[PDB]
Structures are given as structure tokens and as C-alpha cells.
């Protein structure tokens, strides 16, 4: 889990982000459970994420927040599908996690310009 | 080995492929070897009928250090219908060459057996005047400002004011061809609606800019301008390159559409005088590769553009070393190309734009007081002014401030 | 410490004049501290001036080390050492040292100093372990004869 | 000055150039600045000075450092990108003569881009060559020869040991010698020599081409008939079929060889045009697996740089080696360097030692004829990587490790005889 | 006419070999050449050597291949004017001439070989030496060395 939960990691410009809300098992750490969304949604030292946050939702009884970074290098250029079987193809049915949700993604640049985005969008259609 | 590539008696064949240099060799390094060597490394560096020679050899007058080379090709060694064999060979890796501090390539003949390869302009000057209908004067456009930023909408609002106004032209930045900001596709639907509805009751165009990343995506974008009707595109031919832009000339034949040509990197490549390629050469091949209208720039040296306008126009070009053409030019009715003329121009300069271009070329204008509209009239007034006053046998020079509807007075006032 | 074999137009970095005082093994430190530090390449004809004369003069071509020496310069011919004749004698050898680096800093680098008899090559960190700061010159090269094959 | 900002940090999706220009007396550097700035961009969509930095020890040179918002390119487009930063501004008044020096593109533009249809690593692994530097040579004669004739030129240097050979850049097709015809006797050469050998090699088939369409249907050929590499003068021919034909190599997996012929019109002056480094940047985005940069031995630290800048990932800025702006290439595939012309065996030692194994070095005349030509360089390249593997010197030692090889080899000992 | 390659400045960064010959001036005259030493004797290693005679003055020079060619029988001569010596054009500069002992005999018609004038040496064509029946020389000049300048 040390290998995946790293508290003094910045994330870089071109790194996706994302953020998941989960309630671990009874018995299962925080922490244990960050490092295992990591671990699960990446290659398990340039193809892993890594859990830089940890925080307890408040209001929450064995709620939690983690924050994971995934490097640029593991998304196809131009493709939603697969940056999608990439965070969520199976680590919702990770067993130490008696819940799991994905609250956010951060694109970063990078990946955003590989993306057609909207065929004419708001101006283009108003002008249309 | 170092010589025989020059040979001081040899009269050039009808069908050989002239070139002309300007060079200045290394310290220690003879005029006359310093020819055979370009000559050697531009063709060969039964080989005798594979290689060029060297003919005649003389200094620059008034310049130390400073000499004319004339170098023939024989026809056998240029692809038939290929700008870009021709310069793969010709400047290929000679002005790499050690011998020499500096080496400019002044002219090209072309000789008749290998103008007939080619294509041409898809219309040239006379077809063009025909589709277009306007004879007698010079077309004139200008272009549209700001440049960056605006919608297809309000691009085309533009586009429409300038032409309903009176000019004939319309042309796109050439800096924008697809953007975050405005994608191509919907510029040439707001422009050519504003064609439309401005189309007055003559003929009327806009430069779509079709140049593109890939030869896919340049026709992509040229055959949406046919099926939308517009009668001209653009190309920056030296920054896409001659395969590209020869493409699209047998596109553009085939289509019927004119063919525009920018520059658009010129001055990389001709704008020092001891060095690179004369813009004449470029003048030449282009209009071999083809495009009906060719930017030419301003003239308001004199003689050395004057020069190439010739050599683009006519059908036959006498030697003038005065005017920089080295070798008389027969280009066996390949029909010409017309010249555009821009960059620090207004109505003020229209006489002497209408005087030394004559009628077959095109003034492009950058603004008016008043909007647009008055713009495109204070244009088209003063370029009526000078045509018939030129008509009327007149000085433009000397009369130019007599011969030049308040728009062209609001125009001529700020200046 | 480049090993070199006297060997023509390896690198095509241009040609010219450098000069080193030869001294033997055999002589020792005395004929070190006497050679002539500064030669010096001059006036037009290029002849090269010695401050003091020396017997043996060799050049070593103006490899990197070498050029860098400048002053201090000197060449050290070593002869060998073989147990048996019929087995090959080791080649005979010629140390370029530069004097003006006579202080021992570098622990790799090699530095000249007097064996028992002749002279003899120790490392810094050797000669530092026997607390020698000091030395007659620093190796900068080493040789090997001309092999045209 | 309105274009000028002394002091301003670029965004990291800032594109930047650095220009050496030369004022016209009476024009400031400030303003000259000002000036390269306004016309090369046009407040979102302006470029921007941010620096003017003198150049030492020349007088009245200096140089310029400009952002470009990233909104100012088109996605995927070179031919984009040099029309807005190097069309027009090198044509005013202001300035007596002006070079571009470098562009730094940001990763957001770098992922626009497809780069080398293979890059390094594959076109290794496709050509199941390692460890060593790949080696080609030419043929002479070049011009005049029947298609047959130059097929068998073709496979006695490629039966003898080496890798490509390739055409004369000249010939595309002409009355003397047609496209199709060279085309299947080279490829036949290739069959032959390769099932003799039991090891791929290849050559470089000129599919330069006057149209789009021609240039496809030469492509396509040499796809027929199993060519693993084809060429193409990106300068001539130009960007927009350059790129064409790198997206068509990538469909077909064919490698692709870019020769620079014509790059001396625009970079041979050093106070006016484009440095090469930029157009080497430039063709990386483009596309292209082989480049030629040519040799060092027949600047050294210029030419080391553009080398590291089109093989590596990340290139730290150095002003010694030419480098101005630290380039992150986002993963994207190098280019392999191609060295040549003036090289020899003689010079194998050094061209080993200063390319590395992450090249491919084009030799031209040989005493016996081709086969023992190429059985010469062959030798002399094993014996100069395997020496550097050891741990010899190749600047030094390059000549014994040379006259070894050459005793073991007549090939060899006859191409030393120099 | 005479091969000339002239020593230019800063190609002291990286001589790859380099050869060593005697100097003899023109002040020192004749006898001085006479008394050279000829045999230079290479034991070298990375150059090594010694000399058959002890001599004051030494030239450094790089091998240029008509001067490593040599080998024995070669000397330099210095000359404080190039016009003198020199049949055709000078620069006003010094002199250094490399001549060979061993090809001393005139049989090249256009060799050059270095002879005792009356005003002091002189580098003389051979068929001129045969106009005159003069069969033998000092030296026959290899190469002339001209000086470093800006």
C-alpha cells in the first residue's frame, strides 16, 4: 500500500485527477482502502496512480474522500471509453469497500485537446 | 575532374534547361572552378548526357568578390511535369557547397519541350476575365479586420458590407485556417451566404483559404467551397508545398475554380540579396505548378519586379539583364498569371498601382472612417478614376492628385 | 589520463607546434626540477624558445591533455622487467607530467614520484594514505609505440 | 511597445520562439522586439516580447524571446504553425536581417500531433536490429542506369552486409529510367538478398511524387511488393504531403526515410532564415522514423543538440548546445538521425562514439567492388561498437581498433588502404 | 611550383600527430644543414626520440604527409624574408622551408632544391640546376611553411 499511498505528492499539470467518495469494510482503514482505489484503477513506477489525499466526508459516519492521480500516459488520445474502463471498469467491485462513488475528474489540458468537444457548441449554435 | 564541367565554347541546345547563379567563393578559390562545381554538384556529384556544364562565367559588375555563373541541364534529367524535381535537383544541396561564402539562384529557363509537361494555370488571365465578367480595369479586394476572434456570424457581416460596397474580392487572413476560436467549416458557410445575398449583380468571391495539414483535408475543405458555389480559393503554396499545391491545381481545373496564391514565406528564402532563391524563379515555377492570381507585393527594385511581372504575364520574354531576366522565355501560350499587388497601399496610390500594372492584375487593400461599405466604395471609385483618366491618355504620375459620393473624399481628406 | 598510440590524423581537429624537456627514469627528480618549464611558440618562423636548454626534446602531439599543460611541461621515458626473455619485453615508455600541478589533489589522478631507483607513477589517494602532498609532476597521458597493425 | 512586456512569465501553454535579429540603425532593440512580436501575431490573441537579450561579442545583434497563446495554432497542423510564426515577419523594414533561433511547443500542441509513425523503439523491433547503429550506402552511378542493372547494384550491397541502401535523391521518374520498373527490380533485389542472409533489409524507394495522388500510388507500390521503408524530401515536396504520407505509413506500417534536400536555402546563412533544430522539431510533429542531420566529422555542439532534441523526452535548455527553451515531448516517439556525406570506414570510430547506437550512418569507391565496400563498413562498425562496448577509447584507439579489424578482414585491410 | 601549406592560428586545440625537425637559419648558413642531425632516431611511444648529433634549435610541426614522409634527411630553414628565397610572389613574412638531404640529387626538372646562393640560400628549380650542370643541392625543398597571422 506504500507503493500507492504517497501524503507529499503534488500532482502535475498533465496528470488526471479524480475523486471518490467510499465506506470501507468494518475493520478496513482509510488509508488501506485509498492505496487499493489506486492500486485497482492502475497498473496493480510511471503507469500507477497514486493516492495523494485522504480526508473524512464531514457530517459522515466511516465515510471518505480520496484523491488519486493517474499519469497522462495511460489514456488513448481522443477516447471517453477508454478513460472509462481505465477508472471504472472494476474497481467498484473491490472487496475491502462496502460502497464506492466517483464524485469528480480533473482532464488535464493535455488530454482535453485530443478531444473533438461539442460539434458546434453554444456561439456556433446560436449563430446557426 | 574539378574542370570539364565548364567548358567556355558550348552554345546551349533549344532543349536544354538554363540556370543562372550569383555566387562568391571562398578566399583562394578561383571564379572558374567555383562554376564547375556548382555545375558538377547540381547534376552528377554514358554520364556525358547526365551532366551539366557550365557555358559562360563573368564578374558582377561594381561587386568585389562577385560572379555570374550559366550552368545547362539537359531535358533528360527533369520528370516531365514536376516543380518539384525540377528544384530537387537544381538547388537540391549546391548551396551547401564549401567552395563558396554565398550562392543565389537568379533564373531559370525553362525550355519549351519541358513547358508543355506541365499544366499551367487552371484558367489564366483570359479565361479568368471571361468567368469572372470584368473587363477593363484591374479587380480590386481587401481584407478583413480585425483578423482573430470573431464568430462565423460576424465574419461574414464583414465579408458582406466589403462586397456589397463595391469590391470584387474578399480574403481571408492567411493565418487562420481551422482555430479553437472559429472552425473552417462554418466560416465558409457564413461567407458564402454573404456572397449570396450581395451577389451589385455581378460576380463576387471570397479567398477561402484551403490550406490544410494533409492532402485529404485540403480537398475536404476546396470541394465544401464547390458545393457552396465559390467561384476562387486560396493557398499558401510556400508553406504547404508544391506536391500540395499541384494537386490542387488539377483539382481546380477540374472543378472550375480559380486557383489564388500566396507567398506567405517568401521572405525566408529571397530577401537577401546574396543568398537563396530570387523570387522569380519561384515566380516561374509556380506558374508552371499553377494558380490564376499570384501575390507579387507592391511597387509603390522597380525594375526587377516589373521584371517578373512580365515573365508571369506574357507569352514571350526578351533577355534584359536591366530588369533581372537573364534568359529570353517562350512559353508557348501557357496562359499567364495575374499579379496582386498589396501591402502599404491606398486610393492615394491607385494611380501609379493602375499605370505600372495595367489592367490585367488585382489591387488588395487593408481602415475608412465611415465602416466598411465607404471603404469598398472610396476603392472602387478612385480605381475608376485612374482607368479612365489613363483612358483619356493622362498622366497618373504627374496628374495622380487631380484625377483622385463624399467616400472617396472622406478617404482622400484623412490623407 | 588518455593511453595514446602515436598514430596520424585520428581526430581531424587541426595541427601544430608543442614541446616537452625529456627526462630518463634512471636520472630521478633532479633532471625534473631542472627542465625547462616555459617554452614558449613565437615571433613568425614558429621556432619554439626554451628559457634553458635542454639535451632531449620531444614533442607530444597536441592532444587535449597535453595543450593543457602549458607551463610545467615534461616528457619521462620509463624502461623495463621481464622475468623471461623469451616472453615479450613490455614497450619502453614516456611519462607527460605537468609539473606546474605538483601538489597532490585528485585521489584517481596518477602522480609522478621517485621510486627506489628510476622514478615512479602512484595514485593520489596512494600517496595521501603515505601523506605525500606533494609530488613531481601530474601524469596527464599515457604511451604505447606506433602500431601500424 | 505595446507588444513588449520586460517582465512577464510565459503559461505552460504558451508556445515560445526565440529570433537573432539585427535592428536597422536608428531602430532600438525594444522596438525591433516590439516589432518581430506584432506582426508574426496580429489582447488574447497577441503574441508577446518578453525579453531581448543582446547576443555577446556581435554588435548589433540581439535576440527575442515571444510567447503565442496556444489558440493561435490549429490542432495537428505544421504547416499552420510555420505560416503564423515565420511567414511575413521576416519581410519588414525594420530589421536588416532575422533568423529563427527556436520553438518551444507546449505539451498541449505536442499531443496534437501524431509524430513518427514508429519512432525509435519500434522501427528497431520491426527491423529486429540491436544494439549496434544501422549502416546504408548509396549507388554510383546514379544517373543513367538501366532498371536491371541497378537492381543488381542493390543486391550485391545489401548481400554484402548492409542494412539499406538508398536512391539517388534526384530520380523520382524520368525518360532515362521510369518509377515502376526501378521499383520491382530493387524489390526483387531485396527478396534475394534478404532470403540469402536471413536478416530484413531494405531501401529507401523515392516515392516523391509531383501530386498527392502520384505519391500515393507510389507508395502503394512499394506496400505491394513488401518494402519496409520508402523516402521523402519533406522541404521540396513540403509539409502538407509530407504529413499526408506520414498518416498514410502508420495505416500500412511502412517506415518512413526523410531526406533534407534544400535545407541550405533557408538555414546555410547564420544571420537570416531557420535554423535547422526548428525545421528537426518540426518534422518530429510531422512525421517521419529516419532523418538526416549529417555528420560532425566528414557546429559540433549545435548539431549534438537538434540530435538530442528529436531522440529524447526531455531536453533541459542549454544556450551552449543551441538549446534555448527546455522541450517536454509528452511521450512522443524520437526521430533516428541519419549521418553522411564525407564518411568512410576511416571515420567509423568517431561517428560511433558521437551518434551513439541510436542511429543510422550512410557511407558514400571501394578497390574491390561493392559486396567488399559493404563487408568493409560492416566489420568496421561490429569492431568500433564492440570496442566501445569494452570500454575503449574510439577517439583515440580508433585507429588500432581499425587496423585489428582490418588484418582479420581483406575487405576491410584493402578499404584502410588509404 | 613549390608546395606550400601555411601554420595557422589556433590549430594548437587537438594535433593528432606530430613531427620534430632541426633548425637551420639563413644567417647560420650551409654548414649549419651540413651539420643537422639527419637520423632522428624514433624508439617513440607516443613520439619518443633521439637524435644522432645534439642540437640547439628544434621545429615543431604537424604531420602534414609531405612532412612526416620525410622521415630522415629533414630540416627546417628559417628565413626572415619569403621574397628572396621565393622565385615567385612573397607576403614580406618569415620563411620556413622544409628540405629533404636524401633527394639532394637534381632529377625533378621542377622540384625545387635549396642551394648556396652568393647573397646566401636559395630555393632553385631543377632544370635550372641542369642548365648549369649542377648535380647536386643542400636539400630538395618538400614543403614551405608560412606563419600564423590575422
Not at chain 2, 559562360?56 to 561594381?62: A, R, T
Not at chain 2, 489592367?359 to 469598398?376: M, R, T
Given at each position: 500500500?506504500?507503493?500507492?499511498?504517497?501524503?507529499?505528492?503534488?500532482?502535475?499539470?498533465?496528470?488526471?485527477?479524480?475523486?471518490?467518495?467510499?465506506?470501507?469494510?468494518?475493520?478496513?482503514?482509510?488509508?488501506?482502502?485509498?492505496?487499493?482505489?489506486?492500486?485497482?484503477?492502475?497498473?496493480?513506477?510511471?503507469?500507477?496512480?497514486?493516492?495523494?489525499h485522504?480526508?473524512?466526508?464531514?457530517?459522515?459516519?466511516?465515510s471518505?474522500?480520496?484523491?488519486?492521480?493517474?499519469?497522462?500516459?495511460?489514456?488513448?488520445?481522443?477516447?471517453?471509453?477508454?478513460?472509462?474502463?481505465?477508472?471504472?471498469?472494476?474497481?467498484?467491485?473491490?472487496?475491502?469497500?462496502?460502497?464506492?462513488?466517483?464524485?469528480?475528474i480533473?482532464?488535464?489540458?493535455?488530454?482535453?485537446?485530443?478531444?473533438?468537444?461539442?460539434?458546434?457548441?453554444?456561439?456556433?449554435?446560436?449563430?446557426? | 575532374?574539378?574542370?570539364?564541367?565548364?567548358?567556355?565554347?558550348?552554345?546551349?541546345?533549344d532543349?536544354?534547361?538554363?540556370?543562372?547563379?550569383?555566387?562568391?567563393?571562398?578566399?583562394?578559390?578561383?571564379?572558374?572552378?567555383?562554376?564547375?562545381?556548382?555545375?558538377?554538384?547540381?547534376?552528377?556529384?554514358?554520364?556525358?548526357?547526365?551532366?551539366?556544364?557550365?557555358?559562360?562565367?563573368?564578374?558582377?559588375?561594381?561587386?568585389?568578390?562577385?560572379?555570374?555563373?550559366?550552368?545547362?541541364?539537359?531535358?533528360?534529367?527533369?520528370?516531365?511535369?514536376?516543380?518539384?524535381?525540377?528544384?530537387?535537383?537544381i538547388?537540391?544541396?549546391?548551396?551547401?557547397?564549401?567552395?563558396?561564402?554565398?550562392?543565389?539562384?537568379?533564373?531559370?529557363?525553362?525550355?519549351?519541350?519541358?513547358?508543355?509537361?506541365?499544366?499551367?494555370?487552371?484558367?489564366?488571365?483570359?479565361?479568368?476575365?471571361?468567368?469572372?465578367?470584368?473587363?477593363?480595369?484591374?479587380?480590386?479586394?481587401?481584407?478583413?479586420?480585425?483578423?482573430?476572434?470573431?464568430?462565423?456570424?460576424?465574419?461574414?457581416?464583414?465579408?458582406?458590407?466589403?462586397?456589397?460596397?463595391?469590391?470584387?474580392?474578399?480574403?481571408?487572413?492567411?493565418?487562420?485556417?481551422?482555430?479553437?476560436?472559429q472552425?473552417?467549416?462554418?466560416?465558409?458557410?457564413?461567407?458564402?451566404?454573404?456572397?449570396?445575398?450581395?451577389?451589385?449583380?455581378?460576380?463576387?468571391?471570397?479567398?477561402?483559404?484551403?490550406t490544410?495539414?494533409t492532402?485529404?483535408?485540403?480537398?475536404?475543405?476546396?470541394?465544401?467551397?464547390?458545393?457552396?458555389?465559390?467561384?476562387?480559393?486560396?493557398?499558401?503554396?510556400?508553406?504547404?508545398?508544391?506536391?500540395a499545391?499541384?494537386?490542387?491545381?488539377?483539382?481546380?481545373?477540374?472543378?472550375?475554380?480559380?486557383?489564388?496564391?500566396?507567398?506567405?514565406?517568401?521572405?525566408?528564402?529571397?530577401?537577401?540579396?546574396?543568398?537563396?532563391?530570387?523570387?522569380?524563379?519561384?515566380?516561374?515555377?509556380?506558374?508552371?505548378?499553377?494558380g490564376?492570381?499570384?501575390?507579387?507585393?507592391?511597387?509603390?527594385?522597380?525594375?526587377?519586379?516589373?521584371?517578373?511581372?512580365?515573365?508571369?504575364?506574357?507569352?514571350?520574354?526578351?533577355?534584359d539583364?536591366?530588369?533581372?531576366?537573364?534568359?529570353?522565355?517562350?512559353?508557348?501560350?501557357?496562359?499567364?498569371?495575374?499579379?496582386?499587388?498589396?501591402?502599404?497601399?491606398?486610393?492615394?496610390?491607385?494611380?501609379?498601382?493602375?499605370?505600372?500594372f495595367?489592367?490585367?492584375?488585382?489591387?488588395?487593400?487593408?481602415?475608412?472612417?465611415?465602416?466598411?461599405?465607404?471603404?469598398?466604395?472610396?476603392?472602387?471609385?478612385?480605381?475608376?478614376?485612374?482607368?479612365?483618366?489613363?483612358?483619356?491618355?493622362?498622366?497618373?504620375?504627374?496628374?495622380g492628385?487631380?484625377?483622385?459620393?463624399?467616400?472617396?473624399?472622406?478617404?482622400?481628406?484623412?490623407? | 589520463?588518455?593511453?595514446?598510440?602515436?598514430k596520424?590524423?585520428?581526430?581531424?581537429?587541426?595541427?601544430?607546434?608543442?614541446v616537452?624537456?625529456?627526462?630518463?627514469?634512471?636520472?630521478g627528480?633532479?633532471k625534473?626540477?631542472?627542465?625547462?618549464?616555459?617554452?614558449?611558440?613565437?615571433?613568425?618562423?614558429?621556432?619554439?624558445?626554451?628559457?634553458?636548454?635542454?639535451?632531449?626534446?620531444?614533442?607530444?602531439?597536441?592532444?587535449?591533455?597535453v595543450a593543457?599543460?602549458?607551463?610545467?611541461?615534461?616528457?619521462?621515458?620509463?624502461?623495463?622487467?621481464?622475468?623471461?626473455?623469451?616472453?615479450?619485453?613490455?614497450?619502453?615508455?614516456?611519462?607527460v607530467?605537468?609539473?606546474?600541478?605538483?601538489?597532490?589533489?585528485?585521489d584517481?589522478?596518477?602522480?609522478?614520484?621517485?621510486?627506489?631507483?628510476?622514478?615512479?607513477?602512484?595514485?593520489?589517494?596512494?600517496?595521501?594514505?603515505?601523506?605525500?602532498?606533494?609530488?613531481?609532476?601530474?601524469?596527464?597521458?599515457?604511451?604505447?609505440?606506433?602500431?601500424?597493425?
Amino acid at each position: 500500500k506504500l507503493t500507492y499511498y504517497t501524503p507529499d505528492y503534488t500532482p502535475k499539470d498533465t496528470d488526471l485527477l479524480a475523486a471518490f467518495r467510499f465506506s470501507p469494510q468494518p475493520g478496513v482503514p482509510a488509508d488501506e482502502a485509498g492505496a487499493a482505489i489506486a492500486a485497482e484503477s492502475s497498473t496493480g513506477d510511471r503507469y500507477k496512480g497514486k493516492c495523494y489525499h485522504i480526508e473524512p466526508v464531514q457530517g459522515e459516519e466511516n465515510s471518505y474522500f480520496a484523491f488519486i492521480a493517474y499519469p497522462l500516459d495511460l489514456f488513448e488520445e481522443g477516447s471517453v471509453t477508454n478513460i472509462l474502463t481505465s477508472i471504472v471498469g472494476n474497481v467498484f467491485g473491490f472487496k475491502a469497500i462496502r460502497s464506492l462513488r466517483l464524485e469528480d475528474i480533473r482532464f488535464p489540458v493535455a488530454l482535453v485537446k485530443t478531444f473533438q468537444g461539442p460539434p458546434h457548441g453554444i456561439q456556433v449554435e446560436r449563430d446557426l | 575532374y574539378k574542370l570539364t564541367y565548364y567548358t567556355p565554347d558550348y552554345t546551349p541546345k533549344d532543349t536544354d534547361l538554363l540556370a543562372a547563379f550569383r555566387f562568391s567563393p571562398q578566399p583562394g578559390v578561383p571564379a572558374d572552378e567555383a562554376g564547375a562545381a556548382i555545375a558538377a554538384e547540381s547534376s552528377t556529384g554514358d554520364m556525358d548526357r547526365y551532366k551539366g556544364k557550365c557555358y559562360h562565367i563573368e564578374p558582377v559588375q561594381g561587386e568585389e568578390n562577385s560572379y555570374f555563373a550559366f550552368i545547362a541541364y539537359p531535358l533528360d534529367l527533369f520528370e516531365e511535369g514536376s516543380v518539384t524535381n525540377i528544384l530537387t535537383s537544381i538547388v537540391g544541396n549546391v548551396f551547401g557547397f564549401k567552395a563558396i561564402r554565398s550562392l543565389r539562384l537568379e533564373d531559370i529557363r525553362f525550355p519549351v519541350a519541358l513547358v508543355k509537361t506541365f499544366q499551367g494555370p487552371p484558367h489564366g488571365i483570359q479565361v479568368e476575365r471571361d468567368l469572372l465578367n470584368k473587363y477593363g480595369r484591374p479587380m480590386l479586394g481587401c481584407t478583413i479586420k480585425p483578423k482573430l476572434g470573431l464568430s462565423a456570424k460576424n465574419y461574414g457581416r464583414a465579408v458582406y458590407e466589403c462586397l456589397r460596397g463595391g469590391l470584387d474580392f474578399t480574403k481571408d487572413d492567411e493565418n487562420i485556417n481551422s482555430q479553437p476560436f472559429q472552425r473552417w467549416r462554418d466560416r465558409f458557410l457564413f461567407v458564402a451566404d454573404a456572397i449570396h445575398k450581395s451577389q451589385t449583380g455581378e460576380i463576387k468571391g471570397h479567398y477561402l483559404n484551403v490550406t490544410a495539414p494533409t492532402c485529404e483535408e485540403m480537398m475536404k475543405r476546396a470541394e465544401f467551397a464547390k458545393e457552396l458555389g465559390m467561384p476562387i480559393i486560396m493557398h499558401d503554396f510556400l508553406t504547404a508545398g508544391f506536391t500540395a499545391n499541384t494537386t490542387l491545381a488539377k483539382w481546380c481545373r477540374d472543378n472550375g475554380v480559380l486557383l489564388h496564391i500566396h507567398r506567405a514565406m517568401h521572405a525566408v528564402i529571397d530577401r537577401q540579396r546574396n543568398h537563396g532563391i530570387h523570387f522569380r524563379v519561384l515566380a516561374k515555377c509556380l506558374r508552371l505548378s499553377g494558380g490564376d492570381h499570384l501575390h507579387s507585393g507592391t511597387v509603390v527594385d522597380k525594375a526587377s519586379t516589373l521584371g517578373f511581372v512580365d515573365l508571369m504575364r506574357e507569352d514571350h520574354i526578351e533577355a534584359d539583364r536591366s530588369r533581372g531576366v537573364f534568359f529570353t522565355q517562350d512559353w508557348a501560350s501557357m496562359p499567364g498569371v495575374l499579379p496582386v499587388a498589396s501591402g502599404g497601399i491606398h486610393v492615394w496610390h491607385m494611380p501609379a498601382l493602375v499605370e505600372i500594372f495595367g489592367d490585367d492584375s488585382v489591387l488588395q487593400f487593408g481602415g475608412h472612417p465611415w465602416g466598411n461599405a465607404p471603404g469598398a466604395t472610396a476603392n472602387r471609385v478612385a480605381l475608376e478614376a485612374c482607368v479612365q483618366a489613363r483612358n483619356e491618355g493622362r498622366d497618373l504620375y504627374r496628374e495622380g492628385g487631380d484625377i483622385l459620393s463624399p467616400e472617396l473624399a472622406a478617404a482622400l481628406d484623412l490623407w | 589520463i588518455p593511453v595514446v598510440r602515436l598514430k596520424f590524423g585520428e581526430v581531424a581537429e587541426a595541427t601544430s607546434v608543442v614541446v616537452l624537456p625529456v627526462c630518463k627514469a634512471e636520472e630521478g627528480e633532479k633532471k625534473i626540477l631542472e627542465a625547462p618549464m616555459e617554452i614558449i611558440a613565437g615571433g613568425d618562423f614558429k621556432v619554439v624558445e626554451a628559457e634553458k636548454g635542454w639535451k632531449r626534446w620531444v614533442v607530444l602531439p597536441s592532444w587535449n591533455p597535453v595543450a593543457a599543460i602549458g607551463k610545467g611541461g615534461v616528457a619521462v621515458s620509463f624502461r623495463d622487467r621481464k622475468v623471461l626473455p623469451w616472453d615479450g619485453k613490455e614497450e619502453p615508455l614516456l611519462v607527460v607530467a605537468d609539473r606546474v600541478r605538483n601538489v597532490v589533489e585528485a585521489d584517481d589522478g596518477y602522480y609522478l614520484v621517485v621510486a627506489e631507483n628510476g622514478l615512479k607513477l602512484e595514485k593520489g589517494s596512494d600517496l595521501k594514505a603515505r601523506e605525500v602532498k606533494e609530488s613531481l609532476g601530474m601524469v596527464v597521458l599515457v604511451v604505447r609505440p606506433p602500431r601500424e597493425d
